[PDB]
Amino acid sequence: MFIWTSGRTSSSYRHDEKRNIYQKIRDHDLLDKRKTVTALKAGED
């Protein structure tokens, strides 16, 4: 979806390496479907 406004900013989305890791771990879960069910939650604090 394009933009109607105007005020392009910096990356901070593709740059940061720790910003493109989430899609990684989740990729490791795809192989957990067989492993035990959910466990040890994680979010904030």
mmCIF file of all heavy atoms in Angstrom:
data_model
loop_
_atom_site.group_PDB
_atom_site.id
_atom_site.type_symbol
_atom_site.label_atom_id
_atom_site.label_comp_id
_atom_site.label_asym_id
_atom_site.label_seq_id
_atom_site.Cartn_x
_atom_site.Cartn_y
_atom_site.Cartn_z
ATOM 1 N N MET A 1 0.823 -1.197 0.000
ATOM 2 C CA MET A 1 0.000 0.000 0.000
ATOM 3 C C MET A 1 0.867 1.261 0.000
ATOM 4 O O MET A 1 1.622 1.499 0.942
ATOM 5 C CB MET A 1 -0.901 0.001 1.237
ATOM 6 C CG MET A 1 -0.080 -0.195 2.513
ATOM 7 S SD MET A 1 -0.442 -1.787 3.233
ATOM 8 C CE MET A 1 1.098 -2.102 4.080
ATOM 9 N N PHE A 2 0.731 2.034 -1.067
ATOM 10 C CA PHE A 2 1.492 3.264 -1.202
ATOM 11 C C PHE A 2 1.149 4.248 -0.081
ATOM 12 O O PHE A 2 0.484 3.883 0.887
ATOM 13 C CB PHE A 2 1.105 3.885 -2.545
ATOM 14 C CG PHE A 2 -0.178 4.718 -2.499
ATOM 15 C CD1 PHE A 2 -0.210 5.952 -3.070
ATOM 16 C CD2 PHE A 2 -1.288 4.224 -1.886
ATOM 17 C CE1 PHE A 2 -1.400 6.725 -3.027
ATOM 18 C CE2 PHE A 2 -2.478 4.996 -1.843
ATOM 19 C CZ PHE A 2 -2.509 6.230 -2.415
ATOM 20 N N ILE A 3 1.618 5.475 -0.250
ATOM 21 C CA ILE A 3 1.369 6.514 0.736
ATOM 22 C C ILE A 3 0.684 7.702 0.056
ATOM 23 O O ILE A 3 0.934 7.980 -1.115
ATOM 24 C CB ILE A 3 2.664 6.884 1.462
ATOM 25 C CG1 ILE A 3 2.610 6.456 2.930
ATOM 26 C CG2 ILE A 3 2.970 8.375 1.311
ATOM 27 C CD1 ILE A 3 1.323 6.942 3.597
ATOM 28 N N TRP A 4 -0.167 8.369 0.821
ATOM 29 C CA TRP A 4 -0.891 9.520 0.309
ATOM 30 C C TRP A 4 -0.276 10.778 0.925
ATOM 31 O O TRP A 4 -0.365 11.861 0.350
ATOM 32 C CB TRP A 4 -2.390 9.392 0.583
ATOM 33 C CG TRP A 4 -2.770 9.562 2.056
ATOM 34 C CD1 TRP A 4 -3.009 8.605 2.962
ATOM 35 C CD2 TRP A 4 -2.946 10.809 2.759
ATOM 36 N NE1 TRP A 4 -3.325 9.142 4.193
ATOM 37 C CE2 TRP A 4 -3.286 10.525 4.066
ATOM 38 C CE3 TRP A 4 -2.823 12.135 2.307
ATOM 39 C CZ2 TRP A 4 -3.530 11.513 5.028
ATOM 40 C CZ3 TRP A 4 -3.070 13.111 3.279
ATOM 41 C CH2 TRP A 4 -3.413 12.841 4.599
ATOM 42 N N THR A 5 0.335 10.592 2.086
ATOM 43 C CA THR A 5 0.965 11.698 2.786
ATOM 44 C C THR A 5 2.296 12.059 2.125
ATOM 45 O O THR A 5 2.384 12.135 0.900
ATOM 46 C CB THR A 5 1.103 11.307 4.259
ATOM 47 O OG1 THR A 5 2.209 10.408 4.277
ATOM 48 C CG2 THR A 5 -0.072 10.464 4.754
ATOM 49 N N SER A 6 3.299 12.270 2.964
ATOM 50 C CA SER A 6 4.622 12.622 2.476
ATOM 51 C C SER A 6 5.536 12.974 3.650
ATOM 52 O O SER A 6 5.341 13.995 4.309
ATOM 53 C CB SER A 6 4.553 13.788 1.488
ATOM 54 O OG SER A 6 5.811 14.444 1.348
ATOM 55 N N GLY A 7 6.515 12.109 3.878
ATOM 56 C CA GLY A 7 7.459 12.316 4.962
ATOM 57 C C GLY A 7 8.317 11.070 5.188
ATOM 58 O O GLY A 7 8.458 10.606 6.319
ATOM 59 N N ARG A 8 8.867 10.563 4.095
ATOM 60 C CA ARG A 8 9.706 9.378 4.160
ATOM 61 C C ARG A 8 10.721 9.509 5.296
ATOM 62 O O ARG A 8 11.310 10.571 5.488
ATOM 63 C CB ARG A 8 10.451 9.159 2.842
ATOM 64 C CG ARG A 8 11.647 10.106 2.723
ATOM 65 C CD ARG A 8 11.985 10.382 1.257
ATOM 66 N NE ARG A 8 13.168 11.267 1.169
ATOM 67 C CZ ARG A 8 13.510 11.955 0.071
ATOM 68 N NH1 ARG A 8 12.762 11.866 -1.037
ATOM 69 N NH2 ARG A 8 14.601 12.734 0.081
ATOM 70 N N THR A 9 10.895 8.413 6.022
ATOM 71 C CA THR A 9 11.828 8.392 7.134
ATOM 72 C C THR A 9 12.955 7.392 6.866
ATOM 73 O O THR A 9 13.107 6.908 5.745
ATOM 74 C CB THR A 9 11.038 8.090 8.409
ATOM 75 O OG1 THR A 9 10.004 7.210 7.977
ATOM 76 C CG2 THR A 9 10.288 9.315 8.938
ATOM 77 N N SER A 10 13.716 7.112 7.914
ATOM 78 C CA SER A 10 14.825 6.179 7.806
ATOM 79 C C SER A 10 14.301 4.741 7.823
ATOM 80 O O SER A 10 13.115 4.512 8.052
ATOM 81 C CB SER A 10 15.835 6.389 8.935
ATOM 82 O OG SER A 10 15.252 6.179 10.219
ATOM 83 N N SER A 11 15.212 3.811 7.579
ATOM 84 C CA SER A 11 14.858 2.402 7.563
ATOM 85 C C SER A 11 14.415 1.958 8.959
ATOM 86 O O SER A 11 13.258 2.140 9.334
ATOM 87 C CB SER A 11 16.028 1.544 7.080
ATOM 88 O OG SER A 11 16.187 1.606 5.666
ATOM 89 N N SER A 12 15.360 1.385 9.690
ATOM 90 C CA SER A 12 15.082 0.914 11.036
ATOM 91 C C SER A 12 14.181 -0.320 10.984
ATOM 92 O O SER A 12 13.713 -0.797 12.017
ATOM 93 C CB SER A 12 14.431 2.012 11.880
ATOM 94 O OG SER A 12 15.138 2.241 13.096
ATOM 95 N N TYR A 13 13.963 -0.804 9.769
ATOM 96 C CA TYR A 13 13.126 -1.974 9.568
ATOM 97 C C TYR A 13 13.918 -3.109 8.916
ATOM 98 O O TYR A 13 13.839 -4.256 9.354
ATOM 99 C CB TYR A 13 12.011 -1.535 8.617
ATOM 100 C CG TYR A 13 12.456 -1.391 7.160
ATOM 101 C CD1 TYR A 13 12.292 -2.442 6.281
ATOM 102 C CD2 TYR A 13 13.019 -0.209 6.726
ATOM 103 C CE1 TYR A 13 12.711 -2.305 4.910
ATOM 104 C CE2 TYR A 13 13.439 -0.072 5.355
ATOM 105 C CZ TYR A 13 13.264 -1.127 4.514
ATOM 106 O OH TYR A 13 13.660 -0.998 3.220
ATOM 107 N N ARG A 14 14.664 -2.750 7.881
ATOM 108 C CA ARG A 14 15.468 -3.725 7.166
ATOM 109 C C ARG A 14 16.923 -3.661 7.637
ATOM 110 O O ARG A 14 17.641 -4.658 7.584
ATOM 111 C CB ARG A 14 15.419 -3.480 5.656
ATOM 112 C CG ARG A 14 14.591 -4.557 4.953
ATOM 113 C CD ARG A 14 14.645 -4.385 3.433
ATOM 114 N NE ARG A 14 15.606 -5.347 2.848
ATOM 115 C CZ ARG A 14 15.715 -5.596 1.536
ATOM 116 N NH1 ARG A 14 14.923 -4.957 0.665
ATOM 117 N NH2 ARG A 14 16.614 -6.486 1.096
ATOM 118 N N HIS A 15 17.314 -2.479 8.090
ATOM 119 C CA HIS A 15 18.669 -2.273 8.572
ATOM 120 C C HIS A 15 18.931 -3.183 9.772
ATOM 121 O O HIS A 15 19.571 -4.225 9.638
ATOM 122 C CB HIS A 15 18.916 -0.795 8.882
ATOM 123 C CG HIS A 15 19.434 0.002 7.708
ATOM 124 N ND1 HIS A 15 19.721 1.353 7.787
ATOM 125 C CD2 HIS A 15 19.716 -0.379 6.429
ATOM 126 C CE1 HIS A 15 20.154 1.759 6.603
ATOM 127 N NE2 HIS A 15 20.150 0.684 5.762
ATOM 128 N N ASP A 16 18.424 -2.756 10.920
ATOM 129 C CA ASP A 16 18.594 -3.520 12.144
ATOM 130 C C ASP A 16 18.514 -5.014 11.824
ATOM 131 O O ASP A 16 17.614 -5.451 11.107
ATOM 132 C CB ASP A 16 17.494 -3.193 13.156
ATOM 133 C CG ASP A 16 16.511 -2.108 12.713
ATOM 134 O OD1 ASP A 16 15.505 -2.391 12.046
ATOM 135 O OD2 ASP A 16 16.816 -0.911 13.086
ATOM 136 N N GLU A 17 19.466 -5.756 12.370
ATOM 137 C CA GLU A 17 19.514 -7.191 12.151
ATOM 138 C C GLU A 17 18.625 -7.914 13.166
ATOM 139 O O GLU A 17 18.116 -8.999 12.891
ATOM 140 C CB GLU A 17 20.952 -7.708 12.216
ATOM 141 C CG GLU A 17 21.436 -8.160 10.837
ATOM 142 C CD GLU A 17 22.287 -9.427 10.941
ATOM 143 O OE1 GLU A 17 22.967 -9.635 11.956
ATOM 144 O OE2 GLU A 17 22.224 -10.212 9.919
ATOM 145 N N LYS A 18 18.466 -7.281 14.319
ATOM 146 C CA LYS A 18 17.647 -7.849 15.377
ATOM 147 C C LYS A 18 16.173 -7.554 15.089
ATOM 148 O O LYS A 18 15.304 -7.875 15.899
ATOM 149 C CB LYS A 18 18.118 -7.350 16.745
ATOM 150 C CG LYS A 18 19.300 -8.179 17.254
ATOM 151 C CD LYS A 18 19.341 -8.196 18.783
ATOM 152 C CE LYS A 18 20.471 -7.310 19.311
ATOM 153 N NZ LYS A 18 20.213 -6.922 20.715
ATOM 154 N N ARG A 19 15.938 -6.949 13.935
ATOM 155 C CA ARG A 19 14.585 -6.608 13.530
ATOM 156 C C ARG A 19 14.062 -7.626 12.515
ATOM 157 O O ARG A 19 12.871 -7.650 12.213
ATOM 158 C CB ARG A 19 14.531 -5.209 12.914
ATOM 159 C CG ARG A 19 14.296 -4.145 13.989
ATOM 160 C CD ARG A 19 13.076 -3.286 13.652
ATOM 161 N NE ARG A 19 11.841 -3.959 14.111
ATOM 162 C CZ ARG A 19 10.692 -3.322 14.377
ATOM 163 N NH1 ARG A 19 10.615 -1.991 14.233
ATOM 164 N NH2 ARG A 19 9.622 -4.014 14.789
ATOM 165 N N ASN A 20 14.980 -8.442 12.017
ATOM 166 C CA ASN A 20 14.626 -9.459 11.041
ATOM 167 C C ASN A 20 15.022 -10.836 11.581
ATOM 168 O O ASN A 20 15.456 -11.702 10.823
ATOM 169 C CB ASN A 20 15.368 -9.238 9.721
ATOM 170 C CG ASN A 20 14.906 -7.946 9.044
ATOM 171 O OD1 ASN A 20 15.538 -6.907 9.136
ATOM 172 N ND2 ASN A 20 13.772 -8.069 8.360
ATOM 173 N N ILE A 21 14.857 -10.994 12.886
ATOM 174 C CA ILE A 21 15.191 -12.251 13.535
ATOM 175 C C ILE A 21 13.903 -12.960 13.958
ATOM 176 O O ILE A 21 13.852 -14.188 14.001
ATOM 177 C CB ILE A 21 16.169 -12.014 14.687
ATOM 178 C CG1 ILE A 21 15.958 -10.633 15.313
ATOM 179 C CG2 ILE A 21 17.615 -12.221 14.231
ATOM 180 C CD1 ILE A 21 14.568 -10.525 15.943
ATOM 181 N N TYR A 22 12.894 -12.155 14.259
ATOM 182 C CA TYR A 22 11.609 -12.690 14.677
ATOM 183 C C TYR A 22 11.076 -13.695 13.654
ATOM 184 O O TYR A 22 10.588 -14.763 14.023
ATOM 185 C CB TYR A 22 10.657 -11.496 14.747
ATOM 186 C CG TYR A 22 10.239 -10.953 13.379
ATOM 187 C CD1 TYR A 22 9.033 -11.331 12.825
ATOM 188 C CD2 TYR A 22 11.069 -10.084 12.698
ATOM 189 C CE1 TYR A 22 8.640 -10.821 11.537
ATOM 190 C CE2 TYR A 22 10.675 -9.573 11.410
ATOM 191 C CZ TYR A 22 9.481 -9.967 10.894
ATOM 192 O OH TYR A 22 9.109 -9.484 9.676
ATOM 193 N N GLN A 23 11.184 -13.317 12.388
ATOM 194 C CA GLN A 23 10.719 -14.171 11.309
ATOM 195 C C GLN A 23 11.612 -15.407 11.186
ATOM 196 O O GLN A 23 11.303 -16.329 10.434
ATOM 197 C CB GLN A 23 10.660 -13.403 9.988
ATOM 198 C CG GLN A 23 9.428 -13.804 9.174
ATOM 199 C CD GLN A 23 9.706 -13.702 7.673
ATOM 200 O OE1 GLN A 23 10.787 -14.002 7.193
ATOM 201 N NE2 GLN A 23 8.673 -13.262 6.960
ATOM 202 N N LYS A 24 12.704 -15.385 11.937
ATOM 203 C CA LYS A 24 13.646 -16.492 11.921
ATOM 204 C C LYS A 24 13.194 -17.553 12.926
ATOM 205 O O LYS A 24 12.858 -18.673 12.543
ATOM 206 C CB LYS A 24 15.070 -15.987 12.158
ATOM 207 C CG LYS A 24 16.031 -16.543 11.106
ATOM 208 C CD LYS A 24 17.300 -15.693 11.018
ATOM 209 C CE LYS A 24 18.415 -16.279 11.887
ATOM 210 N NZ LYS A 24 19.627 -15.433 11.815
ATOM 211 N N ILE A 25 13.202 -17.164 14.193
ATOM 212 C CA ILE A 25 12.797 -18.068 15.256
ATOM 213 C C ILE A 25 11.489 -18.758 14.863
ATOM 214 O O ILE A 25 11.380 -19.981 14.943
ATOM 215 C CB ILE A 25 12.723 -17.327 16.592
ATOM 216 C CG1 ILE A 25 13.934 -16.409 16.776
ATOM 217 C CG2 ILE A 25 12.565 -18.307 17.756
ATOM 218 C CD1 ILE A 25 13.565 -14.951 16.493
ATOM 219 N N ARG A 26 10.530 -17.945 14.446
ATOM 220 C CA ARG A 26 9.234 -18.462 14.040
ATOM 221 C C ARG A 26 9.405 -19.535 12.963
ATOM 222 O O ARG A 26 8.564 -20.423 12.829
ATOM 223 C CB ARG A 26 8.340 -17.344 13.499
ATOM 224 C CG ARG A 26 7.313 -16.909 14.546
ATOM 225 C CD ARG A 26 5.947 -16.661 13.903
ATOM 226 N NE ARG A 26 5.293 -17.952 13.589
ATOM 227 C CZ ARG A 26 4.038 -18.067 13.134
ATOM 228 N NH1 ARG A 26 3.293 -16.971 12.937
ATOM 229 N NH2 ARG A 26 3.528 -19.279 12.877
ATOM 230 N N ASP A 27 10.498 -19.418 12.224
ATOM 231 C CA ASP A 27 10.788 -20.367 11.163
ATOM 232 C C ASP A 27 11.302 -21.670 11.777
ATOM 233 O O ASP A 27 11.257 -22.722 11.140
ATOM 234 C CB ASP A 27 11.870 -19.830 10.224
ATOM 235 C CG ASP A 27 11.596 -20.042 8.734
ATOM 236 O OD1 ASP A 27 10.944 -19.089 8.158
ATOM 237 O OD2 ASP A 27 11.987 -21.065 8.152
ATOM 238 N N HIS A 28 11.777 -21.559 13.009
ATOM 239 C CA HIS A 28 12.299 -22.717 13.717
ATOM 240 C C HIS A 28 11.152 -23.454 14.411
ATOM 241 O O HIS A 28 11.282 -24.627 14.757
ATOM 242 C CB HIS A 28 13.411 -22.305 14.685
ATOM 243 C CG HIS A 28 14.703 -23.063 14.492
ATOM 244 N ND1 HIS A 28 15.532 -23.411 15.545
ATOM 245 C CD2 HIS A 28 15.299 -23.535 13.360
ATOM 246 C CE1 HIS A 28 16.578 -24.062 15.057
ATOM 247 N NE2 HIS A 28 16.431 -24.137 13.702
ATOM 248 N N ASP A 29 10.054 -22.735 14.593
ATOM 249 C CA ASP A 29 8.884 -23.306 15.239
ATOM 250 C C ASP A 29 8.145 -24.205 14.245
ATOM 251 O O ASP A 29 7.478 -25.158 14.643
ATOM 252 C CB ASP A 29 7.917 -22.211 15.696
ATOM 253 C CG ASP A 29 7.342 -22.401 17.101
ATOM 254 O OD1 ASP A 29 8.098 -21.984 18.060
ATOM 255 O OD2 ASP A 29 6.229 -22.920 17.270
ATOM 256 N N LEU A 30 8.291 -23.868 12.972
ATOM 257 C CA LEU A 30 7.646 -24.634 11.918
ATOM 258 C C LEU A 30 8.076 -26.098 12.021
ATOM 259 O O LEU A 30 7.414 -26.983 11.479
ATOM 260 C CB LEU A 30 7.925 -24.004 10.552
ATOM 261 C CG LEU A 30 7.269 -22.647 10.291
ATOM 262 C CD1 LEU A 30 7.919 -21.944 9.098
ATOM 263 C CD2 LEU A 30 5.756 -22.795 10.116
ATOM 264 N N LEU A 31 9.182 -26.309 12.719
ATOM 265 C CA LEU A 31 9.709 -27.651 12.899
ATOM 266 C C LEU A 31 9.450 -28.108 14.337
ATOM 267 O O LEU A 31 10.044 -29.079 14.799
ATOM 268 C CB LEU A 31 11.182 -27.708 12.492
ATOM 269 C CG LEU A 31 11.560 -26.928 11.231
ATOM 270 C CD1 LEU A 31 12.567 -25.822 11.551
ATOM 271 C CD2 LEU A 31 12.069 -27.868 10.136
ATOM 272 N N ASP A 32 8.563 -27.383 15.003
ATOM 273 C CA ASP A 32 8.219 -27.700 16.378
ATOM 274 C C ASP A 32 6.835 -28.353 16.415
ATOM 275 O O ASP A 32 6.455 -28.952 17.419
ATOM 276 C CB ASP A 32 8.169 -26.437 17.240
ATOM 277 C CG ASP A 32 9.140 -26.421 18.421
ATOM 278 O OD1 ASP A 32 9.066 -27.273 19.320
ATOM 279 O OD2 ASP A 32 10.013 -25.472 18.398
ATOM 280 N N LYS A 33 6.120 -28.214 15.308
ATOM 281 C CA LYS A 33 4.788 -28.782 15.202
ATOM 282 C C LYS A 33 4.800 -30.208 15.757
ATOM 283 O O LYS A 33 3.798 -30.678 16.292
ATOM 284 C CB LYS A 33 4.277 -28.686 13.763
ATOM 285 C CG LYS A 33 3.313 -27.510 13.601
ATOM 286 C CD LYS A 33 2.364 -27.737 12.422
ATOM 287 C CE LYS A 33 0.908 -27.515 12.839
ATOM 288 N NZ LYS A 33 -0.013 -28.032 11.802
ATOM 289 N N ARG A 34 5.946 -30.856 15.608
ATOM 290 C CA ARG A 34 6.103 -32.219 16.087
ATOM 291 C C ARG A 34 6.574 -32.220 17.542
ATOM 292 O O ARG A 34 6.200 -33.097 18.319
ATOM 293 C CB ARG A 34 7.109 -32.992 15.231
ATOM 294 C CG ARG A 34 7.032 -32.556 13.767
ATOM 295 C CD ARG A 34 7.879 -33.468 12.877
ATOM 296 N NE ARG A 34 7.056 -34.589 12.371
ATOM 297 C CZ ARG A 34 7.401 -35.368 11.337
ATOM 298 N NH1 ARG A 34 8.557 -35.152 10.693
ATOM 299 N NH2 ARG A 34 6.592 -36.362 10.948
ATOM 300 N N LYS A 35 7.388 -31.226 17.866
ATOM 301 C CA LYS A 35 7.914 -31.101 19.215
ATOM 302 C C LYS A 35 6.762 -30.841 20.186
ATOM 303 O O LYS A 35 5.615 -30.687 19.768
ATOM 304 C CB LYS A 35 9.013 -30.036 19.265
ATOM 305 C CG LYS A 35 10.396 -30.666 19.084
ATOM 306 C CD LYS A 35 11.076 -30.140 17.818
ATOM 307 C CE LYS A 35 12.582 -29.981 18.031
ATOM 308 N NZ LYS A 35 13.302 -31.186 17.565
ATOM 309 N N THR A 36 7.105 -30.798 21.465
ATOM 310 C CA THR A 36 6.113 -30.559 22.499
ATOM 311 C C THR A 36 5.307 -29.298 22.184
ATOM 312 O O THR A 36 5.715 -28.487 21.353
ATOM 313 C CB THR A 36 6.839 -30.495 23.845
ATOM 314 O OG1 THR A 36 7.485 -31.760 23.952
ATOM 315 C CG2 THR A 36 5.872 -30.469 25.031
ATOM 316 N N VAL A 37 4.175 -29.172 22.862
ATOM 317 C CA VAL A 37 3.308 -28.023 22.664
ATOM 318 C C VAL A 37 4.003 -26.768 23.196
ATOM 319 O O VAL A 37 5.133 -26.834 23.675
ATOM 320 C CB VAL A 37 1.947 -28.276 23.316
ATOM 321 C CG1 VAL A 37 2.015 -28.055 24.828
ATOM 322 C CG2 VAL A 37 0.864 -27.402 22.682
ATOM 323 N N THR A 38 3.295 -25.652 23.096
ATOM 324 C CA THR A 38 3.829 -24.382 23.561
ATOM 325 C C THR A 38 4.376 -24.524 24.983
ATOM 326 O O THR A 38 3.942 -25.395 25.735
ATOM 327 C CB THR A 38 2.725 -23.331 23.436
ATOM 328 O OG1 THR A 38 2.024 -23.702 22.252
ATOM 329 C CG2 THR A 38 3.275 -21.938 23.123
ATOM 330 N N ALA A 39 5.319 -23.653 25.309
ATOM 331 C CA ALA A 39 5.929 -23.669 26.627
ATOM 332 C C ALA A 39 6.803 -22.424 26.796
ATOM 333 O O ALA A 39 7.243 -21.832 25.811
ATOM 334 C CB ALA A 39 6.722 -24.965 26.807
ATOM 335 N N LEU A 40 7.028 -22.063 28.051
ATOM 336 C CA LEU A 40 7.840 -20.900 28.360
ATOM 337 C C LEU A 40 7.455 -19.750 27.426
ATOM 338 O O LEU A 40 8.010 -19.617 26.336
ATOM 339 C CB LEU A 40 9.327 -21.256 28.314
ATOM 340 C CG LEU A 40 9.850 -22.106 29.475
ATOM 341 C CD1 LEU A 40 10.673 -23.288 28.963
ATOM 342 C CD2 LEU A 40 10.635 -21.248 30.471
ATOM 343 N N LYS A 41 6.507 -18.949 27.888
ATOM 344 C CA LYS A 41 6.040 -17.815 27.106
ATOM 345 C C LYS A 41 7.146 -16.760 27.037
ATOM 346 O O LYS A 41 8.215 -16.936 27.620
ATOM 347 C CB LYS A 41 4.720 -17.284 27.669
ATOM 348 C CG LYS A 41 3.551 -17.634 26.746
ATOM 349 C CD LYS A 41 3.080 -16.404 25.967
ATOM 350 C CE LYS A 41 3.839 -16.266 24.646
ATOM 351 N NZ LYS A 41 2.973 -16.643 23.508
ATOM 352 N N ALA A 42 6.851 -15.687 26.317
ATOM 353 C CA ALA A 42 7.808 -14.604 26.162
ATOM 354 C C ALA A 42 7.121 -13.415 25.487
ATOM 355 O O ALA A 42 6.392 -13.588 24.511
ATOM 356 C CB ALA A 42 9.021 -15.102 25.373
ATOM 357 N N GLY A 43 7.377 -12.236 26.034
ATOM 358 C CA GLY A 43 6.793 -11.020 25.496
ATOM 359 C C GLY A 43 7.538 -9.783 26.003
ATOM 360 O O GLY A 43 8.484 -9.319 25.368
ATOM 361 N N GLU A 44 7.084 -9.284 27.144
ATOM 362 C CA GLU A 44 7.695 -8.110 27.744
ATOM 363 C C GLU A 44 7.645 -8.208 29.270
ATOM 364 O O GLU A 44 6.611 -8.552 29.840
ATOM 365 C CB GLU A 44 7.018 -6.829 27.253
ATOM 366 C CG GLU A 44 8.031 -5.895 26.588
ATOM 367 C CD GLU A 44 7.673 -4.429 26.839
ATOM 368 O OE1 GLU A 44 6.505 -4.074 26.424
ATOM 369 O OE2 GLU A 44 8.485 -3.681 27.406
ATOM 370 N N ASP A 45 8.775 -7.898 29.888
ATOM 371 C CA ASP A 45 8.874 -7.946 31.336
ATOM 372 C C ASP A 45 8.424 -9.323 31.829
ATOM 373 O O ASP A 45 7.233 -9.557 32.027
ATOM 374 C CB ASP A 45 7.971 -6.894 31.985
ATOM 375 C CG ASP A 45 8.654 -6.015 33.034
ATOM 376 O OD1 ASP A 45 9.863 -6.135 33.280
ATOM 377 O OD2 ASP A 45 7.880 -5.165 33.620
#
